[PDB]
């Protein structure tokens, strides 16, 4: 949208916007949380092996040493 001032909005204004935002979200194509969890798991799994905080940082490669 543009740039709007809140002071310029009345009760009716807001309620109407709320309903108009509600009308758009209701149409969302929601993915199954299982699928999302799988994709999430896979992503983290393909990278944690090289995560300094997880695997540990060697006392020679640590910049804060």
């Amino acid at each position: 949208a543009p740039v709007i001032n809140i002071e310029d909005l009345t009760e009716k204004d807001k309620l109407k916007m709320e309903v108009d935002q509600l009308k758009k979200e209701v149409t969302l194509e929601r993915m199954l949380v299982s699928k999302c969890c799988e994709e999430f798991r896979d992503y983290v799994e393909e990278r944690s092996g090289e995560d300094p905080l997880v695997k540990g940082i060697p006392e020679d490669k640590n910049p804060f040493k």
Binding site: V3, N5, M17, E25, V26, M31, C37, F64
Partner: protein, 340 residues
């Protein structure tokens, strides 16, 4: 209009449908999907650096993209740009207002910003101007305190405010490019998507909202929290984000799912969360609490993999370096600490 407002009932009815639609897709949780996954081994990070300099409560901190320089903000009216490797503060910017609440580091490293109860987000040049590091701009427009701010680039910054809105700014002209309204409560934090196409805000209305930068619209509003969402953080891949709240829990939300994947909490943890961040892989979800402690959660197992305990007061903020090499924690105890 008249007696029963079609709108007020239409809002409820739509909220109901959305609830039903989400429940239908909520088959499992993440921790159930990760049973085969082995635990990460107790994380026992240690303080490698203790940044000394502040004389009062630290409220914000933000790593610079170089994963070495960082800036912090304190209620004494000070914005310090430290060097985490040497513990040397490169700058010590005094502020007009002492009640600072936020600070950001420009991706480029050229500027920093801050604001708070003065409802202003002051921008500072500390590069191309050798000498008295002065405020380049003072973004005025918010009728409420500045709760958080993040630069998209040198000329663009997004702010969230206690006035219920968020806004995109053109720092050159000092004008608001876009205003993001929708929250019914004080916005407390925001997080930019990896590609900066979207950003997410968490507010006192116990909801988080995803906004499209360009189109300047709210695409989705996540619910679940029982109270104020004080913190928020985008996940590395940009398809999920975590939140910290006064309801004593951190949550992981997925944009496609339009709801949460997992909740991290222990019934013996009742205080509030002030900040939240992910490790480079996303395996860990670190959170700062009001009990002076920082818990490191195993994002997949929902187990507490570790506990950074090193502050004599509330850990007000925390951030993981861009290179995943370290994590810093700010606190009401005046100190900042780097761990790994």
């Amino acid at each position: 209009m008249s007696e029963l407002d079609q709108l007020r009932q239409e809002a409820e009815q739509l909220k109901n449908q959305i609830r039903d639609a989400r429940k239908a897709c909520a088959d499992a949780t993440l921790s159930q999907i990760t049973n085969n996954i082995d635990p990460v081994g107790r994380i026992q990070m240690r303080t490698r650096r203790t940044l000394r300099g502040h004389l009062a409560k630290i409220y914000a901190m933000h790593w610079g993209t170089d994963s070495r320089l960082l800036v912090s903000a304190s209620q004494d009216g000070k914005l310090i740009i430290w060097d985490s490797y040497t513990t040397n503060k490169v700058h010590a910017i005094p502020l007009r207002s002492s009640w600072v609440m936020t600070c950001a580091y420009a991706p480029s490293g050229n500027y920093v910003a801050c604001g708070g109860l003065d409802n202003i987000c002051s921008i500072y040049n500390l590069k191309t101007r050798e000498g008295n590091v002065r405020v380049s701009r003072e973004l005025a427009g918010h009728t409420g305190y500045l709760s958080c701010c993040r630069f998209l680039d040198d000329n663009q910054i997004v702010t969230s405010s206690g006035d219920t809105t968020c806004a995109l700014w053109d720092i050159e002209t000092g004008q608001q490019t876009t205003t993001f309204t929708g929250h019914t409560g004080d916005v407390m934090s925001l997080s930019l998507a990896p590609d900066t196409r979207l950003f997410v805000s968490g507010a006192c209305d116990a909801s988080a909202k995803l906004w499209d930068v360009r189109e300047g619209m709210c695409r989705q509003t996540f619910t679940g929290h029982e109270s104020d969402i004080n913190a928020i953080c985008f996940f590395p891949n940009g398809n999920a984000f975590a939140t910290g709240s006064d309801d004593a829990t951190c949550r992981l939300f997925d944009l496609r799912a339009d709801q949460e994947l997992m909740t991290y909490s222990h019934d013996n943890i009742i205080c509030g969360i002030t900040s939240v961040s992910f490790s480079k892989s996303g395996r860990l979800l670190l959170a700062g609490y009001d009990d002076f402690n920082c818990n490191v959660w195993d994002a997949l197992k929902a187990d507490r993999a570790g506990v950074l305990a090193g502050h004599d007061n509330r850990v007000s903020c925390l951030g993981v370096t861009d290179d995943g090499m370290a994590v810093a924690t700010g606190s009401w105890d005046s100190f900042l600490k780097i761990w790994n």
